[PDB]
Design a binder for this molecule. Sequence first.
Ligand SMILES: [Ca+2]
Ligand SMILES: [Ca+2]
Ligand code: NA
Ligand code: NA
Lengths: 838, 840
Amino acid sequence: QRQTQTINDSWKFLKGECTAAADSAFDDSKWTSIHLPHTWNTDAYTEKDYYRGTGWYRRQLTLPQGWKEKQIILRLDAAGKSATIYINGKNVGEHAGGYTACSFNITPFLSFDTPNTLAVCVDNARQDIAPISGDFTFFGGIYRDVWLTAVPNQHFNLTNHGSDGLFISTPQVSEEQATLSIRGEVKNDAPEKATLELTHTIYRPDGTLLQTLKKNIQLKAGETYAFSNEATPVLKPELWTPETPRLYRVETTLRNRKTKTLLDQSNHYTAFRWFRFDGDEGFFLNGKPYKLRGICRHQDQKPIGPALTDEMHRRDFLLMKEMGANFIRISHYPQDDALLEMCDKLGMLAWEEIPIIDIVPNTPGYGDNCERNLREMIRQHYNHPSIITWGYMNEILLVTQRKYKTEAELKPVLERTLALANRLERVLKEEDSTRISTMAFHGSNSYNETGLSKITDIVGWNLYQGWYGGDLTGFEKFLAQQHQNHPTHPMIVSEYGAGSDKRLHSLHPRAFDFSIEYQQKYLEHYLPVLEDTPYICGGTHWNFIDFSSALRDESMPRINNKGLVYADRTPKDVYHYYQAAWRKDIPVLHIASRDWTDRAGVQQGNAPVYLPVKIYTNLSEVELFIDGISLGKQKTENYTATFEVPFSNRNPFLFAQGNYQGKTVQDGLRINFTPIPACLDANNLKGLELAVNVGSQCFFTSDESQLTWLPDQPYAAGSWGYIGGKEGTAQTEIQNTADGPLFQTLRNEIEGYRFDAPQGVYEIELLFTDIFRRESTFGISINGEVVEESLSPCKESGYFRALRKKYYITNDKEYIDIRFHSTSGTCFLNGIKLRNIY
Amino acid sequence: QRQTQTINDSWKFLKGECTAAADSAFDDSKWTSIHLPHTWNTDAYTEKDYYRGTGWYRRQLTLPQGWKEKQIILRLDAAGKSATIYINGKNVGEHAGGYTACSFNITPFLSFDTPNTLAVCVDNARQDIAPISGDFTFFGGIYRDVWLTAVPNQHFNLTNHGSDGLFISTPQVSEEQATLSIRGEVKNDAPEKATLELTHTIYRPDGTLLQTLKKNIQLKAGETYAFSNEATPVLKPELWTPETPRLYRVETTLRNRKTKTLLDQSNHYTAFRWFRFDGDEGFFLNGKPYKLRGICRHQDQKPIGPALTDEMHRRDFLLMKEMGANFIRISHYPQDDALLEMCDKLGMLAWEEIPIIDIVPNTPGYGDNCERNLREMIRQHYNHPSIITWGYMNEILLVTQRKYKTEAELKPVLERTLALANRLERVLKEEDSTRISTMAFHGSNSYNETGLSKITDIVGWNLYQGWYGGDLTGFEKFLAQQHQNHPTHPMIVSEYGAGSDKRLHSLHPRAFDFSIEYQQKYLEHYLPVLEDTPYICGGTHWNFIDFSSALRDESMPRINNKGLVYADRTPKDVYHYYQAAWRKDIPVLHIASRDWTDRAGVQQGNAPVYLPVKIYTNLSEVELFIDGISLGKQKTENYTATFEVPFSNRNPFLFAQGNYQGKTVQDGLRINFTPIPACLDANNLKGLELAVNVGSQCFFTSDESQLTWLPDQPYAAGSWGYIGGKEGTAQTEIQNTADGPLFQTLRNEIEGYRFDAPQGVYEIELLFTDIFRRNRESTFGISINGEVVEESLSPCKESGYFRALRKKYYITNDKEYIDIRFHSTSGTCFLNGIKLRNIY
Ligand SMILES: [Ca+2]
Ligand SMILES: [Ca+2]
Ligand code: NA
Ligand code: NA
């Protein structure tokens, strides 16, 4: 019979190229001991220039004696970007593509007397394998399961494009009945002919036998037999939806006809559903209007990269499912079998695509490798009823339009692009007539003008109005114009999202301040448009997670921070906005302050400091308390309510409650609050560390020091603040700080900074980063005394590099008046911190 | 005037040796751009064998035109373990010791017409500098502030052992009056004699002027002039305590006598307190009995090492102060000026020591460097009234008695050790007649037998009964025995504590399971002994933080996890045990489940799963609710109550309530719960991932995958569990897993593992690690329902010892059970974990 098990354990690894590394007798004792899954690119979570090249893997294979007469199939579920397999020094085969499986019959190369050597040469530098461009890290290594499967000489074909070799589909489905087709290949690897019986057993969702199909077959030695068996039509089929994920098990078994002894067996699920996409009325599932409530999911986790164990894939799935998602865009590459298994069985519709992104290059062999990857994806995941649509391109004009401006320059590239797109559409439809084709576009009409949008069955728009420029209302406007101009192209919003950073909060959130609050504003605008617009089939939020993209700077360098959950899968508060909107079956009541647990604010006297506390909920009304005091009830709108909360005590307890479907519902949490005096005097300076995020309207709380840097404020008599200047912002990474966003904002052309404070000795810390890559040079004086004659941050440290300078100052006045004196370029300040010492 | 500012910015760094690295014209454009503070040993948070050797730092100095006529003083507050300073290629000076400041007048080496090159060669491999042994990482680099100070040619001496050059103390203090001695040195670096006026101005705590002292002084060109001025006695001084940290500012000023022009100015605090240690009655502060409620604090933070900014030092202090500590053992080395400032001003008594630990080596120069470091600590930190005691050795017999078992080998080492201890005690008392000397011992009477305990004023015992062997009650027994035999030696319990790991929880906590709950049992035992025993002056908990110690394995390799707070300074729940016990002025009500937010347990049918929920509180009575349902009121004892909580729903809200000082007090939080069926059937296998920590009585929740692995349970009819074998445990690091504690426990000589479960296709994952390196070697087969799945598995042969193996098998079950059996071939059969899912 069949035996399948992993060989993930007991590997040796070497980064780089290496002489004789495939040889059996090679000494690899000084190599690194590792366990799969593995990537050699955990460096990508700190370094922009992560290693792209070769890595070698070696494992001993000592085979059971029980396998001596069996075929042994090696399966690598994934290796990025390409792999070459050696057994005992001999090249067995290779695979191009980092997200699809490969498999090899390795029986001829193996010994059963001596130990065998499996060596794999993996390469992630190859420019002829998709992706060659895209907003994520191209991790190198063997980062999914590796298997050995031992089968008898007559067995199902396990070397058809790394798949199971069986293909099951439902040519007709309706409420009244459905048909079922069961297809595949049997291989006879014996030296003699064979007479076999093939059986398909089909089971109802409750597990009872529905039907048995039997068929005798005869195979010559070495023959591959292709079968295609139709079942008795299924009457009143139990239909599959994400809410009701009814699956019919199909067990396919192979027996020696005479002896009836079992040879090979393969289980799959099938399911009964039909669907369609309408340009006017949206998506339909089993005849009923159905809104696609979707998310996109990248497959990495800081700092292990894509080297996730399968319980981590299931963890991700369960978080998405508990959020109320009914649709996933598995992007930009096909993903672990463990994920798709959950989509089938727990219920989530799915879109899966291969990573042809940004530009079709004139790279020899690239097209041929994409075609193969498309066949591999479709054949490997053919039997997942959750999957309703295949894609192969994402924003394929984005870099093209950046690199080539003139119609002359564009012509060859657009020809090449349109040709590859039409070629893959044909391949797609050859491989699978039972699913819909899709393509994702960036927000430009060039996808219509070039003809790209005529090619697939449906289209996806990746839309970011209100994030990458424009207005939030430009979203529904863009879609309305698409629908007017191309009403027969059904639309999914295949990406939308906004970046956020737990460290940043704003009372006046703006795009690219990276505040938690602005992402909320953005998503609170987008989700109702998706829900309420009939010609929007649905949307897939970009992204479920904060994910690895080594080329990114912005507030969290190396990370795309548009997640609904943090990289460690802790949900952001806004996860519960979705959960409130998408789950009616349970009460949802979430105080949205888990992202904002370390609060501070300027206080007048001993009066409370008011800060907003948001609530996400599907209750119609909620009451918030702080340290036992009611702040009143509020009616919820768009699944949310915000309270203006009086902060005073240092460790307040927030508590909310209301009623849902007849039951009382509650939430609560403690947070931290630190008041900062508006008016400094000798008493309130003790223990005070007055820190200011100059040039910003955000609170910045360091996740390294836990200190909150307040939003900038203009000087007023009796108080403290800036004099003159204008806000400036950069998104380039700042060297030599963990507190990037503090230095990425500044007050430019600043004239002064003033604190009204008592006489004494003070520690003043000035923060600089020059972000304007003649060169800015300026003096600094404090209360009439020169503290810097001629400071040039860029001459001293270079651009985009933090300088933190502390000064001890003796104040013999009733104020500390810091003045900037420009001699070249402009004066700027990125942060300031004051403490009284004496 | 005096100008003091950092030069922490704009450095270049190179690890390793580099010829000509000091030269002004050297090309460092490919070096690494860094900002101080800096360590080159962030590797220690992953690698045991962290780099010890040389590192080079280079900065350009372009001096202000306004400094042309000034003296320029360079101060490195710390460089581990040694630094050699070069200015424009010229060797300016050097320092040995990784925790004390050094300073240099660099004026002679600088040009004001051209840019200057500052180069520092730092070395953390040197064996003639303490520590050479100890349970912490010897981080290399310049990890505290670096300063330039510009002063006139007449100024206060800034190159006396890296100190401020002024020394203020209170020779007599009582409630009625106190005396005040203001001493220091003035330097005249000018070619002309100077006639100067020295002024001391003394302010009351409320900032009003108390007294002005003025003195004419005359210095020859080049002279170092020592001054010593007595203030008028202070009548009815406002006394300093941690609770009432009253400070008197002393402002010292130097003016040119003829012109009256201000030259230099230096501020310090003084304060008035007196204290006493008694062998029977403990510690007294300002004539009153006073229990020292202490913590120890190491100075690193994962993953930045000791390269903390000063707001991080202040964060640490505020956390300790808010817990109600009134005493800090600043150990095993002196720490940032930022920390001591807060001890003075916000109020905490202090013990500070240098790191002479484990064994006194026979290394030339070692003793001399220790003496210099002691003098440097005392002079640099002289003016902190928070400090009441200086130490210089910790567990100085520990490695000695491990290494040397013969009297011939021991005798010279003990001779050497007693010699150095006596040498440093003399130095301490020469340097400071105003503070108490202390030494910390490991828990052995040999410190008395060797005579080490007769040297210092007081003694510290580092005690771990109930952790490193023994019963918890052995703690108070040890101390009673000391008090009996050495009644005149006043005692501090200078270390005590137990390791914990947020990932591990146990209903039956035991030592070295690293559960959160055992550390709680340990500390709940110790703290009342400390509080209630009169002849115990107090204790300093080891440690406030989970800290770097690269040589450690155990549950969190590279980390000593005996903290009250995690490395990132998030408090553990037991922080709030201390807070409840030590804060009377605020209500403390803490549901002690922040360490246990991801719960799971075996469920019978649909009945609730009971798990304990502890509360730490200074309330006398508390009520706990789960999802709005009251679980009743319990009376608290030892600042705690535990409820047996019925879990069922997936995301329960826990809420606690009570009254304190006439007001309602509340706490609450949500946590996650996952029920696991005791009896598998087709219904409840859907979406189930049944994971078990074989060989352990601990729940293990992975901080990587968030999956909880259940405590092991014996097979019972209709259920699932192990057959045969006994528990085994290792503390060695396990390779190739983030989930070390899962692999560090196993069931040895296991016979089977069984799940009663319906027919179907299952994924079985088996976890292995061979922990018996002293093996002959373990080889075994495994069958599942008679099907062989391994005919000859040997973890140690295939992967080696202490390395994770995780193997997945797909099996087809045509029975009503899944019966995994282990078949010995060689050595023993073992299993470290198992996980089951139904696939078809
Ligand atoms: Ca997998
Ligand atoms: Ca400092
Ligand atoms: Na800023
Ligand atoms: Na275990």
